[PDB]
From Swiss-Prot, chain B:
Record-level GO BP terms: ATP generation from poly-ADP-D-ribose; chromatin remodeling; D-ribose catabolic process; nucleobase-containing small molecule metabolic process; nucleoside phosphate metabolic process; nucleotide metabolic process; ribonucleoside diphosphate catabolic process; ribose phosphate metabolic process
Domain of life: Eukaryota
Result of altering residue 99 to Q: Catalytic inactive mutant for both ADP-sugar pyrophosphatase and nuclear ATP-synthesis activities. Reduces catalytic rate 6300-fold
Protein name as catalogued: ADP-sugar pyrophosphatase
Organism: Homo sapiens
Gene that this sequence comes from: NUDT5
InterPro entries: Nudix_hydrolase, NUDIX_hydrolase-like_dom_sf, NUDIX_hydrolase_CS, NUDIX_hydrolase_dom
Cofactor(s) listed in the protein's UniProt record: Mg(2+)
Length: 194, 194
């Protein structure tokens, strides 16, 4: 019933552009929308996000998260490890690479989502969500070495999976951080499964 | 130790703008970023709300109520939590109950309300509250519920059992061209991982 008629460039930066989208509404009326896209997609999706489950014997299972300054937010955010997929990179390879660069952890693919939308009211941005387990008892994960890219500055925050939502609420309360919506959504469903 | 130095407008639409963000990196060095923001954010604690609507009915499994809409930015149909922008002077809780009734017909009861969480913090300043609402599907109000879609709003309601959410989403994606929202996928993944 609905579809794109045309896109008009409003403004293109190096990494992001603003388009004016003309589309057919399901009554047969023509309508316009202001749409954000990345200029970087070549790719099943723009990015991967990694759900990293740190498994250590005789410890609570943890979810490994990252804290970073986010210039669009003007502040620090708590997020799943994540990055853009390199041209010709698989989502799985991107996941293990981003997880190792951001956390220094070496993990195993458990499962990989299809492309899922980040904010479909505003952007065409998509990611693969990639569930990875980390054998925290293996020697390679003893002293995990975070290898940042140029300009990346990442703090690792491991939180017990069984209390994730309460732990995130605490950090926000004490640390004035913004929690990522996908991290918060995961933490909610862990509580709601009960 | 990182902070914003300046925000230079690049391009302002009616609904979205692109900014050149200048910030201090943690080595004491000036860098820039391309940042997306909405033009619509006034005194709201966030741009929007997304609703996690748990439909509860005697001798039924709990359903998660989802909506399917054409999203011009994506050029296609997306499956999302009911969601909308917070009106000037509207509370996140009132926005969530209003958007839930407008998009699905269902009259919910507030359960919980997140702090402001970031939609895509590497790209935008966009934030939502994630509001968990229970719907009493035994109430006569919620019997044959009628969406009240706004102007140029066309929403289909999809209620899926919480206990099978991820496989039910996977089956919808296998049967037509559509994108699942990243927050819905993150929530369905955590239900499986619990
Ligand atoms: F920011 C973009 F998402 C965007 N572009 N158009 C809109 C509208 C409009 F009513 F104009 F269609 C409402 C809300 C957001 N919009
Ligand atoms: F698209 C915007 F999110 C955006 N602005 N700058 C960047 C960079 C840069 F390396 F330049 F810093 C990398 C990735 C995305 N960026
Ligand atoms: Cl798992
Ligand atoms: Mg990253
Ligand atoms: Mg990285
Ligand atoms: Mg909406
Ligand atoms: Mg609406």
């Amino acid at each position: 019933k609905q579809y794109i008629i045309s896109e008009e460039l409003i403004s293109e930066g190096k990494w992001v552009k603003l388009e004016k989208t003309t589309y057919m509404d399901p009554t047969g009326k023509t309508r316009t929308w202001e749409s954000v896209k990345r200029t970087t997609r070549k790719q099943t999706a723009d990015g991967v996000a990694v759900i990293p489950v740190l498994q250590r014997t005789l410890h609570y299972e943890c979810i490994v998260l990252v804290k970073q300054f986010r210039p669009p937010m003007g502040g620090y955010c708590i997020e799943f490890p994540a990055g853009l997929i390199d041209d010709g990179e698989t989502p799985e390879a991107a996941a293990l690479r981003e997880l190792e660069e951001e956390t220094g952890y070496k993990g195993d693919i458990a499962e990989c989502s299809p492309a899922v939308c980040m904010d479909p009211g505003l952007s065409n941005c998509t990611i693969h969500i990639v569930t990875v387990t980390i054998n925290g008892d293996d020697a390679e994960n003893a002293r995990p070495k975070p290898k940042p890219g140029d300009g990346e500055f990442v703090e690792v925050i491991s939180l017990p999976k069984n209390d994730l939502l309460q732990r995130l609420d605490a950090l926000v309360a004490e640390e004035h951080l913004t929690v990522d919506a996908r991290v918060y959504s995961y933490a909610l469903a862990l509580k709601h499964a009960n």
